Amino acid sequence: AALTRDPQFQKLQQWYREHRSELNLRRLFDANKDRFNHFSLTLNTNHGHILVDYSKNLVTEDVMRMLVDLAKSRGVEAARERMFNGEKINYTEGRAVLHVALRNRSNTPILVDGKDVMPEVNKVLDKMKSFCQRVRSGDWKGYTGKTITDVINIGIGGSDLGPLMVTEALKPYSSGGPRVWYVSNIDGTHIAKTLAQLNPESSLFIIASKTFTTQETITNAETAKEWFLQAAKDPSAVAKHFVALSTNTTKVKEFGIDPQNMFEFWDWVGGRYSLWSAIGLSIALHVGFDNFEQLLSGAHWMDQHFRTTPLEKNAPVLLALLGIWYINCFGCETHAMLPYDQYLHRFAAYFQQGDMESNGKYITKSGTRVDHQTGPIVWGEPGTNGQHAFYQLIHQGTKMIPCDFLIPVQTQHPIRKGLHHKILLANFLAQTEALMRGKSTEEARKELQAAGKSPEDLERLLPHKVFEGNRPTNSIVFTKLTPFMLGALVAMYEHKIFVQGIIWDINSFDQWGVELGKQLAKKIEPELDGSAQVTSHDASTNGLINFIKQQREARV
Amino acid sequence: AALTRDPQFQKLQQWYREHRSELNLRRLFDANKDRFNHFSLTLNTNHGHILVDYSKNLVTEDVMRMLVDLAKSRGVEAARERMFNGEKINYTEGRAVLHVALRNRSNTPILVDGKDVMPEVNKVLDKMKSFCQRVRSGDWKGYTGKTITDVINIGIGGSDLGPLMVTEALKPYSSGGPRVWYVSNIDGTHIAKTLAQLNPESSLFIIASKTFTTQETITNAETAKEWFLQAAKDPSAVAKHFVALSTNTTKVKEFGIDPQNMFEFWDWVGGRYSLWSAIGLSIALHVGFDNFEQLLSGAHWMDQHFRTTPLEKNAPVLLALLGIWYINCFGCETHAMLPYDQYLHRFAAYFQQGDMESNGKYITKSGTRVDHQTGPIVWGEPGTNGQHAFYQLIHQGTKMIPCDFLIPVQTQHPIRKGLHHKILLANFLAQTEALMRGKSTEEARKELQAAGKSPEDLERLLPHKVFEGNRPTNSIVFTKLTPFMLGALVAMYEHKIFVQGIIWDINSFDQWGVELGKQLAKKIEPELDGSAQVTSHDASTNGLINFIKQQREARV
Ligand SMILES: O=C(O)[C@@H](O)[C@H](O)[C@H](O)COP(=O)(O)O
């Protein structure tokens, strides 16, 4: 694999072998009262600041220099230029990778095969803006002349989680918007309990499918159409209540949606990078097209930061490189994303998909097997809740877990004269300080003595209350979670994932495990019909099917 | 530490080093027509069957036998008896561990400090049952004589996630119950956006706090009480709209809750094991006290299964030992929990707390540092959505991830004559089969040839479409997700976590990192008031605070 053969990588590994034991955060901060200034970026977007404080990481100036030299050696900048210039860097599928075109507010030409994509991007954005104005205003009416009160996105994966996470994050911007619902799971619970709360006369369905063939989405869409037509009877009424976000007009027409109700996107829009496209229509309906443009504008700002900033001060590049340090030298399997913001409750889940589906790969560009770690397991829940739960393992377990802590300075709900937000901020700050510092035997002993503990009881309990610390964090602090700032933060992590992929020499933009998934069930689905026991698979698959057939009509 | 000293553990590690190459699932199933029959448990609860199929694990007869011998050598059965007999096995805090007493439907005496706890357990259950009848029937009136339409649980961690996960899982059983809301985060978004949707005349607040001192919960409770008092303008009305779930009568009265409105629990009820106690009041209110009793009964059945079953066919013990095998021989950092059930969308999050807060430890019973791995990072999302996202990494990444796949045979919503649930079952089966089998270069070449790809397209795609497989899974299939079956499944994992803790010789039942977290914010809280620069901490803590002070009245 290219990475293990890279001389900057070998130099990094050799340094780690010799100097690893010098990396003690308490000692590094005590020796350098300017450590924060040396290891932090502040970005002024003109619509809020982003502080990326990476000073609580197990790095020194020499480590950061070697990491930046690795990014140069691995051709990060040349790879970046290929992406932005519309070259087919999705080399397995032979596609461009142009989510950056979707939010290209400058309208600088971006050529695929010598043809500018921006006229087509802007045509779909115009169509979305006109449709959002009509639905939100009440101009667009249901089949009995009522205004739309409820918008239901039907889609899965990349056609589901981005719009869900963004509408959750920007809920305060939704006044005067229809309610938004996300139906994704084939589990009939999902559509059933959603439809039970809706009126067909005032419900608009958005069938979100790049291919328009995904079994979960097409099955959910047929169930919603059956429910709708049971009320409306007239197949003509479907053109007022179903629209499609797709690449395929033929499949859309075959399903029964007027192709005029199709909002188009392109092969070079990956599902997990698609919320910036027509896939974002549920966002624009919920918070208005103006706020959707602000979301694209923030992503565009961070695209420019990524493109023009020297590597050593480049936010997504440095987040990527800290990740490489922890994955490929320390051997950490996981990365925790811990936003101190209830509106961002689906933010970690969104990057669980964006990161793991991108860089969960083992075959390099030359078709050779990697001989090193690739993408980590991404997980997390919002603070402060995690502090009462899994933070126990982060503080006192046997695993090293790099954590990203994120928080807005200004809250959308400054209740009780900002008392809640002050407590939230203090916890955000105090947790990363404790993870870094820990607590020595002597500090814990002196606190137990002050608490009034007996001499044995104290020496019993003492070692259990000792924290080794040295647990590294990034703190990412931003003025306020506005549509623009959310756009910038999402795009920052997209480019972090892109940089890690280039360094690992994998294709961040295909998903052959997900493409396989979509063909796995077809062999077993017909075998589940009838009482007859199944013998066509391995013993376990067969046993599980036969148990399902047995329990199918058990009464409990 | 005890485990690395244990001769059965050393024998297990010896075997791993030498026979690791035997462990090929494709080969194990081809050689053993009875592998499913030999490596699965079928449990008849008399209220549904549970099939625990562990046959797609990297184990043989010899491994399972050596694992059961380790459980005997580490004293699992003696530790189990100490828990159930009310001995103070929470040795750092000096407390019993008696969640099993909360659901002891047999009413067999359990003595703590020589007194039966069961009278007190059953007194609170009678009080809960009496209150739930009054609220749900409409007998219990708000301060303007209206029936309660909305119940708001206020609490964090163990006082939040259990009731939240259970009310989400048992949502079909809440017909005729009030709506339930969970406010947990200090983030003022959480209480603010909840209160905006409530009528104070018909809203009952539940203040859930073991200690009744937790800053998030007490701050949220005060905010709700202020909002309530602004509408009601009568301190007497508080007794109609606020109840407490706590161990601390003093602090409940001091807060202003009528001591008649207090539902008590005890020191030996761990927060992450508390949903079976008074903490479960919001469950009983939502789905009715009868369903809550069924939930306790299911747990009680699994408690008795755990207690009476020989180790080698004991469900929680075998799940625990498969975990030890992957954690302490294979070195897997993580455990994925993947329920194929939308109602279980918070089940992995619940055990993320339950597992990681229990076994995220590095200090043994003797007060010595472990020299081996302990608890894993637990994570997951419901199927089928994961198949479109992070399953890419499970199939083709560089990480080994033991996964538990869970599914009910019978759906709560058999829509389209069972078509959705048939697709869901087919996906659940096909995914674990594909993880085990993978797809060879030869098989992938044949599929591309058959698809009609040019030699150029074929040779470019071929190596990217290969799956090495050999990825182990548990399949846990149960008749139906009823209150009883949910209680059995939650208790099964509770006891898995207990067994792993005893084998590691750690205290599964303290949480000194969570207790530390509750003390951290108080030293930083005062520094945030006024706009003076802060210099009293490390450079990074100082840097972050100063940035917060700069941006907190920036206008964006
Ligand atoms: O990441 C992906 O590519 C997947 O999650 C897809 O977005 C998902 O399978 C849906 O595909 P489609 O939009 O073609 O229905």
Ligand SMILES: O=C(O)[C@@H](O)[C@H](O)[C@H](O)COP(=O)(O)O
């Ligand atoms: O696991 C724990 O102990 C915590 O998650 C607690 O449940 C949480 O801190 C709430 O404590 P209390 O119930 O004392 O408010």
